[PDB]
């Protein structure tokens, strides 16, 4: 069995090599760990390796993400996996759905909300609030607000008209 630490998982999920990340599921079933463990999340900002998959896309098409979405559903923790967000006070509440909306990827938004991405995740971080003179971007702290404020008509229609979890248009 191949031994895995946290650093090699973040490095393989950024380099877009799925052949490196192939013995993770036999290792994770043996170790009885989960992907939503404290050892796999970054200690400063609560960054799961799904988040690190969403920051470092290659040509708008990351192929590593569909692999470890399957690893979370084999290890029956997909709901905590996509709804894991940053625990730091500067990015508090930012899930991978907010990154998928910001990176202009229609397929990455669809693939997340099928797997149980919370479309009501309040990204109430210090970067996403007002913070009068500090650098930041306020969009209303909601995923259907982020598709609206960033000129994404196809995504703001999709968040309101999907079969899995429809967005509350009156949410605040």
């Amino acid at each position: 069995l191949k031994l895995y630490d946290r650093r090699s998982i973040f490095d393989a999920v950024a380099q877009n090599n799925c052949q490196e990340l192939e013995s993770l599921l036999p290792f994770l079933q043996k170790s009885r760990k989960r992907l939503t463990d404290s050892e796999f999340k970054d200690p400063e900002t609560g960054k799961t390796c799904l988040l690190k998959a969403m920051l470092n896309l290659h040509n708008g098409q990351n192929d590593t993400i569909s692999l470890l979405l399957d690893i979370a559903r084999q290890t029956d923790s997909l709901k905590e996996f996509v709804n894991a967000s940053y625990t730091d006070s500067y990015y508090k509440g930012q899930t991978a759905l907010h990154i998928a909306i910001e990176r202009r990827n229609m397929a990455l938004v669809t693939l997340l909300v099928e797997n149980g991405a919370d479309v009501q995740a309040a990204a109430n971080g210090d970067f996403f609030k007002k913070t009068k003179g500090r650098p930041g971007f306020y969009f209303g702290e909601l995923p259907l607000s982020l598709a609206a404020c960033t000129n994404q008509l196809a995504i703001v229609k999709f968040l309101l008209q999907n079969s899995w979890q429809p967005a509350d248009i009156s949410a605040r």
């Binding site: 970067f127 650098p135 930041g136």
Partner: protein, 75 residues
């Protein structure tokens, strides 16, 4: 001229006259070493060009005394 003549009055203020460069990393040199250049920071906004750039230094946005470099650098 007033700003520069004020800085000439004190050698101690010249070490304070580093204007917010913070000794920031801006990528990697050839030979693959850290670049570490004094950089003045300017916030901007565009509502038509959405800036999907090849070279972006930090993958995490903003500045909160916590840094994280981007893996898109060749070195």
């Amino acid at each position: 001229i007033t700003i520069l003549d004020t800085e000439k009055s004190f050698l101690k203020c010249m070490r304070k006259a580093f204007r917010s460069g913070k000794l920031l990393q801006v990528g990697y040199t050839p030979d693959g070493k850290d670049d570490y250049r004094w950089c003045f920071r300017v916030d901007e906004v565009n509502w038509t060009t959405w800036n999907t750039n090849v070279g972006i230094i930090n993958e995490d946005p903003g500045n909160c005394e916590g840094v994280k470099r981007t893996l898109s650098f060749s070195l």
